[PDB]
Chains A and B, each alone.
Chain A
């Protein structure tokens, strides 16, 4: 179902935004 895969996409997006924000903090 769409809900599960949407949730997974949103989690991967949150993790990528977290990685980018940590990388911008350090740099």
Chain B
């Protein structure tokens, strides 16, 4: 039981000492990627029936 608590303590040590990126940076990244790949999506943008193979 104490080996389990020492592995959980070493886990929490490894999880504490990491690099954290601010929320607004990656939250702007996600917007950048959704903007960049907006046109190509066939669900966001409806495709003309000449291309859609399911019809």
Direct contact of A and B (CB under 8 A): no
Using a CB–CB distance below 8 Å, which chain B residues touch chain A?
A: none
Using a CB–CB distance below 8 Å, which chain A residues touch chain B?
A: none
